[PDB]
């Protein structure tokens, strides 16, 4: 019964319409979902706009009228110039008439402002289409009608507000360059009249409703109008005094003054500077007397959240930071402005104590701006000495937890390990560190005194707390590098001693975990001090080893990160033999590695072996390094040697899930050490390589055998997943080493040969769900590093992975997402390093290659999209490099227009806007080949065009015909003008892209002006 309004043959029952509308907004459940579908079908009916006047006059529902105007908006924006002139004036009339009617009825104007704003916006859409060329008296008539009434005048400010937004703030990407410049100049020419009306209202007005609307419109004008309207009138006085006292106008006025503040003023004119000083001086005076003094507790006010206090404190912060970042120097030389300068900053100090991360970031951005200037600008920092001192307390007391601290208090009072990384506080910590480092350089004595005294009031318990000891420790760690070595020495010594007292005094598993994490972070942040104090560095490392036995997993996991963090910076002191030591400390670490890492989780053990690898690589005595390496790998190599004896003698131990886990961890240990030793790992790789590749084969047979006996579901079992982990870690170890190898002859002669034999055929002959995308990733590194040395090896890779992988990923854009990405990385590196491998492909396989590239264009996945467009560019270049040879000639004849049309399709379908730049670049290259005559042969068949017609002519005909059928609502002239402009600009990427953007605008509407494509002249 609700579907009656969808029959347009019979007349439209508005009573039924309002019921469907009410069922959608006020109803629920199924009745709501059914009405929603009906209302969509009604709105999307191309004749629905003819019911517009009917619904607006006779409907007793404002939502029904709103939806009627949405139907008109869509009609005006997309099909206006398709209507006869009769309906264009008729539609204009009952839109203007509806606005007038609603403004004269005070009750309607009061209670239906949503419907009035939608009507105003609909009117503005008409203006964009026909003002001023077909409506030159719109602004004069608007100014006149504003004297006739207050409601009309107020509503006229809304129309002008929306108009300024649509022309200046949102015209780009919604209209052509030509039409945007037309409406900007049209509005600019008639603005002096608009300003008079707006200024007269502001001066004599008393209707808060109309004043706010006028200030709301003024906020939009300040985005583009000449400076003289702002400064050469009395309007800054009005904004900074009158409209700051009343809270009804304060919020919008403060936003108006933030836009003025952001302007870069003529720095030679003394009066502009005087005015810029004055509206600031006035504004801060109104705050102090009408809102709150500079001593007020803004932290408490924000937390209370009365009325709009939180929004006003936000706008205030935005105003103070904008103005001062631009104009504080205007206040720094005049002694009579000094108090104003400091009061403004004192409000900022109070704003920086609010508990609201995003607001704190806004203020912290300004502090960084300030301290960075005081760090370089002569004779400035003494002005802000007191401000900076207060700021040191604010930063230190609001330090966020560093990424390295892995302990945290839960909702039970317990100290525990973190579930997930606090990814949204990484950036905030770096920002606080950056400001606090600057503040420390500006007064290192003051910062030390704040931190030492604060730490002294932690010992005696004056201010002991987990929050307080934490922020303090994090602050101490974050300023590393600002002090002198000698001051840092005395400083750190005192911090450790006081922190070592706390861990004794504060007992309990929770307390001990807090202080332990804080000492770890501080010590780990001062490498310079550890290098110079070997005996302490040694004690630290040994105490970290003790924490590797802590039952508290947070402490334990952090001791492992701290260890490798210290090693990355102090590695050199572990590889040499220190005085009073019988051997380099790396030899003591390795000898007890089983005891030290006994209670660690396997991936923590790997981090430990990687850290040892960092140290071993500092030894440049090849003999000694290789000796250390084999000592480190002694445990995994003894475990390895036993596995090989058992597996090769009886391929049924790998059935044991426990043995699979042991193997995987051995390979993972070799990955960890290889990651940090790189080229120096080769001796260890050679010890396991040939046996490791045999294990890859044996594991592969097991996986296949279990898929055949249990089905595809077997790939989800822990057994098979364990076997594939072995294969993936082996691939990762070979990828990791080849990516850092320095001796590429050994890679070719020793490694690549058996590698390709072990992986390629296994990949090719497995079922899709059993293929490992890591194969593709490994092969990409092989081609990247040595592909230029194994031309026949690259061919073998294509034959094995190209067609079978393409068949996996060419049925949709969703399945096998890992294979999809690595596939196009592989084609990319091959195309730029071994293009010859593609010349050796049979014509049919080279056609799948081209199909594969255009397939990547149509992805929304950015990972494969950008590679698809890059392969296409590089393929074009690889071909033209060949010159006038048969393969290049036949390439263009076969695939040139395919790339042009496929590039065009993704440019214009509104589903691939993310890759517009590279699409445009690719299309520009293609067109420039023809207009430079770099295609040697004709792009057309002998009998489709006169003899001797140039490729330029035929290209313009092919494209004209293509666009004509793809976009039949375009006139022949639009297409011809567009192509003429496009081809003339194939050496100007900026202009070429502009011409494309203008096209994407015009295909969204009817009647686009073809001269718009002459904009670049």
């Amino acid at each position: 019964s609700m579907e009656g309004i969808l029959d347009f043959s019979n007349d439209l029952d508005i009573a039924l319409l309002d019921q469907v509308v009410s069922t959608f907004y006020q109803g629920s459940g199924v009745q709501q979902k059914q009405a929603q579908e009906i209302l969509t079908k009604f709105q999307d009916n191309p004749d629905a706009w003819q019911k517009a006047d009917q619904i607006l006059q006779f409907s007793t529902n404002p939502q029904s009228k709103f939806i009627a105007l949405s139907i008109l908006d869509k009609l005006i924006t997309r099909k206006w110039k398709l209507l006869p002139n009769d309906h264009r004036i008729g539609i204009r009339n009952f839109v203007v008439g509806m606005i007038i009617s609603m403004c004269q009825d005070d009750e309607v104007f009061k209670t239906q402002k949503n419907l009035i704003n939608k009507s105003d916006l609909t009117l503005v859409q008409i203006l964009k289409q026909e003002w001023p060329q077909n409506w030159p008296e719109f602004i004069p008539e608007l100014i006149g009608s504003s004297s006739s009434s207050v409601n009309v005048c107020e509503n006229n400010m809304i129309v002008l507000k929306l108009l300024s937004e649509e022309v200046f703030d949102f015209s780009a990407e919604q209209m052509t360059q030509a039409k945007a410049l037309h409406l900007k100049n049209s509005m600019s020419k008639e603005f002096e009249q608009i300003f008079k009306l707006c200024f007269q209202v502001l001066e004599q007005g008393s209707s808060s409703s109309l004043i706010v609307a006028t200030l709301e419109s003024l906020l939009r004008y300040l985005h583009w109008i000449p400076y003289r309207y702002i400064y050469e009138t009395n309007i800054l006085e009005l904004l900074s005094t009158k409209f700051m006292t009343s809270p009804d106008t304060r919020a919008i006025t403060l936003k108006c003054l933030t836009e003025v503040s952001n302007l870069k003023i003529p720095q030679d004119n003394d009066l502009i500077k005087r005015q810029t000083v004055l509206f600031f001086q006035n504004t801060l005076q109104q705050i102090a007397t009408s809102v709150m003094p500079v001593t007020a507790d803004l932290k408490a006010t924000y937390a209370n959240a009365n009325g709009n206090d939180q929004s006003f404190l936000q706008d205030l912060a935005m105003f103070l930071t904008t103005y001062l970042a631009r104009n504080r120097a205007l206040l720094e030389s005049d002694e009579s402005l000094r108090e104003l300068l400091l009061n403004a900053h004192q409000y900022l100090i109070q704003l920086s104590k609010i508990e609201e991360r995003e607001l704190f970031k806004t203020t912290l951005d300004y502090w960084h701006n300030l301290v960075a200037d005081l760090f370089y600008e002569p004779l400035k920092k003494h002005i802000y000495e007191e401000i900076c001192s207060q700021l040191r307390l604010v930063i230190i007391e609001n330090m966020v937890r560093p990424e390295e601290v892995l302990v945290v208090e839960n909702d039970e009072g317990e100290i525990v390990r973190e579930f997930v990384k606090e990814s949204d506080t990484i950036q905030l910590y770096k920002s606080e560190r950056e400001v606090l480092v600057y503040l420390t350089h500006l007064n290192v004595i003051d910062t030390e005194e704040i931190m030492i005294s604060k730490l002294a009031r932690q010992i005696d318990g004056s201010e002991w707390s987990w929050h307080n000891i934490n922020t303090l420790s994090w602050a101490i760690g974050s300023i590393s590098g600002t002090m002198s070595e000698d001051t840092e020495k005395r400083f750190v010594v005192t911090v450790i001693k006081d922190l070592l007292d706390l861990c004794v005094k504060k007992r309990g598993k929770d307390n001990k975990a807090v202080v332990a994490s804080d000492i770890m972070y501080v010590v780990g942040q001062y490498p310079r001090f550890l290098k110079a104090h070997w005996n302490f560095l040694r004690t630290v490392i040994l105490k970290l080893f003790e924490f590797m036995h802590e039952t508290h997993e947070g402490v334990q996991d952090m001791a492992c990160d701290t260890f490798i963090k210290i090693v990355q910076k102090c590695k050199y002191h572990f590889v040499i033999q220190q005085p009073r030591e019988s051997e380099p400390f790396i030899q003591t670490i390795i000898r007890d590695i089983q005891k030290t890492t006994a209670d660690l989780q396997p991936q923590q053990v790997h981090t430990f072996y990687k850290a040892c690898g960092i140290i071993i690589s500092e030894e440049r005595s090849v003999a000694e390094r290789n000796r250390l390496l084999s000592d480190l790998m002694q445990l995994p190599n003894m475990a390895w040697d036993t596995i090989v004896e058992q597996s090769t003698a009886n391929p049924t131990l790998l059935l044991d899930s426990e043995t699979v886990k042991i193997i995987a961890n051995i390979i993972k240990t070799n990955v960890a050490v290889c990651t940090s030793m790189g080229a120096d790992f080769y001796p260890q790789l050679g010890h396991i390589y040939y046996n490791m590749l045999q294990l890859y084969r044996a594991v592969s047979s097991m996986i296949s055998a279990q898929v055949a006996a249990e089905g595809l579901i077997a790939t989800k079992t822990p057994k098979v997943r364990g076997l594939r982990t072995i294969k993936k870690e082996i691939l990762k170890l070979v990828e990791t080493y080849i990516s850092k190898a320095r001796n590429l002859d050994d890679v070719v002669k020793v490694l690549v040969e058996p590698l390709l034999n072990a992986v390629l055929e296994d990949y090719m002959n497995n079922v899709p769900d059993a293929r490992d995308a890591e194969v593709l990733n490994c092969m990409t590194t092989v081609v990247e590093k040595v592909g230029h040395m194994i031309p026949q090896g690259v061919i073998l890779i294509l034959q094995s992975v190209f067609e079978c992988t393409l068949d996996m990923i060419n049925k949709d854009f969703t399945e096998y997402p890992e294979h999809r990405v690595e596939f196009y990385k592989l084609l990319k590196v091959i195309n730029e390093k071994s293009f010859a491998a593609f010349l050796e492909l049979p014509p049919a396989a080279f056609k799948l290659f081209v199909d594969a590239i255009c397939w990547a264009f149509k992805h929304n996945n950015r990972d494969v999209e950008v590679n698809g467009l890059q392969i296409a560019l590089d393929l074009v270049k690889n071909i033209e490099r060949m010159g006038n040879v048969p393969f290049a000639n036949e390439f263009h004849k076969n695939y040139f227009f395919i790339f042009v049309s496929e590039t065009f399709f993704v440019l214009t379908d509104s589903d691939h806007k993310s890759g517009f730049s590279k699409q445009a670049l690719l299309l520009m290259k293609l067109i420039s080949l023809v207009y430079d005559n770099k295609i040697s042969v004709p792009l057309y068949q002998e009998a489709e065009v006169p003899q001797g017609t140039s490729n330029q002519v035929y290209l313009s005909q092919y494209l004209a015909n293509m666009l004509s059928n793809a976009f039949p609502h375009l006139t022949s002239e639009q297409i011809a003008s567009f192509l003429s402009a496009l081809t003339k600009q194939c050496k100007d990427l900026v202009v070429f892209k502009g011409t494309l953007r203008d096209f994407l605008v015009q295909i969204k509407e009817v009647g686009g002006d073809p001269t718009d494509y002459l904009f670049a002249e």
Binding site: S657, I713, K716, T717, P718
Partner: protein, 126 residues
């Protein structure tokens, strides 16, 4: 001078877990909640139940007796999960029937869960 739900229940076991429900009309598992799964013993009736709440929202994603009729079966894809049928769970209003699966951080926790689960069934027989 004048100046200015579970409390009647005992917790027998607690472990962090992720809970799933099997959508038969789609033949896929759909996650239902991640948080702390508790075995709660009523001190008035001595009847043990599972009560699980989602983190942050604290909404109930499991609430039902650990009936002696139930039995924990393994899932083909995991060595740290258990599957079993539940005939009366009131996490979302009226007592619905569900095929649940619950997964844990380690196989060690999954096997401990099974030990405590069976202990509770014995309690719920007396």
């Amino acid at each position: 001078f004048e100046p200015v739900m579970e409390e009647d229940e005992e917790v027998l076991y607690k472990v962090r877990a992720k809970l799933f429900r099997f959508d038969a009309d789609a033949k896929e598992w759909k996650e239902r909640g991640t948080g702390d799964c508790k075995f709660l013993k009523n001190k008035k009736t001595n009847k043990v139940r599972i009560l699980m709440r989602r983190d942050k929202t604290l909404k109930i994603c499991a609430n039902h007796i650990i009936a002696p009729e139930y039995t924990l079966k393994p899932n083909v894809g995991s060595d740290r999960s258990w599957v079993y049928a539940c005939t009366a769970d009131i996490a979302e209003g009226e007592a619905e029937a569900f095929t649940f699966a619950i997964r844990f951080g380690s196989k060690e926790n999954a096997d401990k869960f099974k030990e405590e689960f069976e202990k509770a069934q014995e309690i719920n027989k007396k």
